[PDB]
């Protein structure tokens with residue numbers, strides 16, 4: 059029998075193995091993350107999941123915020139409050155800011171940008187190059203609206219992505235459009251007409267300018283007053299170099315070398331200068347914790363950032379069938395870019411306001427449902443909100459390049475486990 063005055067624990071190997079019930083999906087997944095850190099495959103990660111009710115409030119942190127040893131020769135930890143580079147995860151923030159302007163009657167989603175962005179309206183479309191290497195430019199056909207900006211259907215693209223703009227830079231057209239090693243997201247020309255196709259581009263950088271001009275505030279002040287303050291966030295900024303307290307604790311970016319798969323310190327220009335202006339497509343620094351507050355507020359429809367009906371708009375398929383078709387074709391053909399991150403490489407999608415919408419269940423009742431909204435940031439950051447499942451999740455790394463297979467597999471493992479144990483209905 060038992061020992062007098064002592065809790066009756068396992069007394070032999072039979073009752074000690076049975077004393078521990080078998081490991082569920084989440085515990086097994088945590089082991090995968092720990093092993094990835096231990097085997098040096100990743101520097102670290104933070105994973106977070108929340109429901110609306112409060113019964114799911116899950117945060118786990120693994121590994122280091124850098125590969126550079128600190129003053130004590132140690133590798134400091136990546137924490138839920140570690141300042142990180144959000145890159146394109148900034149786009150959700152800027153989308154919210156635009157939508158607030160709409161709610162306050164400052165802008166209309168279908169008005170042309172000409173009033174507030176005459177500098178964008180006057181910009182030509184790059185069509186090609188002559189034999190001498192001179193750019194061939196033409197007038198835009200049709201007008202860009204704010205809804206085109208929010209849905210990436212304006213005709214704007216990115217210099218690092220579109221072959222026309224790669225050439226444009228090669229020919230030297232953008233050598234004066236940079237300061238502190240950061241290239242202007244406003245200078246490059248469009249590569250198509252608005253409504254012609256879905257093209258990932260500098261749309262939210264322009265939308266951010268629109269917010270600035272509609273409100274008379276710089277995007278930094280607007281951010282602070284309208285997203286940070288209502289959520290009690292004190293560590294979310296475009297101006298990292300003005301926050302000594304965040305600088306002292308920030309993550310470093312890590313890069314995985316293509317040749318050997320080894321992790322190395324990445325001395326990113328974005329961590330040495332903020333730049334002269336706020337680029338709402340890419341420029342915010344914050345912690346995983348503060349980012350989850352944004353996702354969670356949207357999931358709860360608590361009205362702190364936007365009215366519930368405005369949030370609902372963000373989740374509606376915005377593309378007419380022609381564009382929906384072309385986006386899916388482009389994305390299906392481009393697993394090397396993979397905007398959808400952990401999502402299946404072939405999936406019926408649309409675009410909402412703020413990200414990609416799944417138009418079908420990713421794996422029946424095992425994973426994200428139809429109507430879920432998602433996007434990411436360069437350093438393998440992935441976020442999603444799933445209203446049907448009652449969940450939102452974020453996987454935060456500080457590792458480039460985007461679409462790193464190890465991070466993608468871990469992210470899938472994370473979401474799969476959370477859904478398996480905690481999805482409702």
Ligand SMILES: CC[C@H](C)C(=O)O[C@H]1C[C@@H](C)C=C2C=C[C@H](C)[C@H](CC[C@@H](O)C[C@@H](O)CC(=O)O)[C@H]21
Nearest residue numbers: 145146218339340395397433434435436458459460
């Ligand atoms: C500048 C940040 C950009 C917009 C970003 O985060 O985009 C993410 C988001 C993801 C959902 C979809 C993406 C689609 C295409 C790219 C592979 C891009 C990453 C490019 C990055 O590795 C190099 C640039 O940072 C070079 C520069 O800054 O000039 C990635």
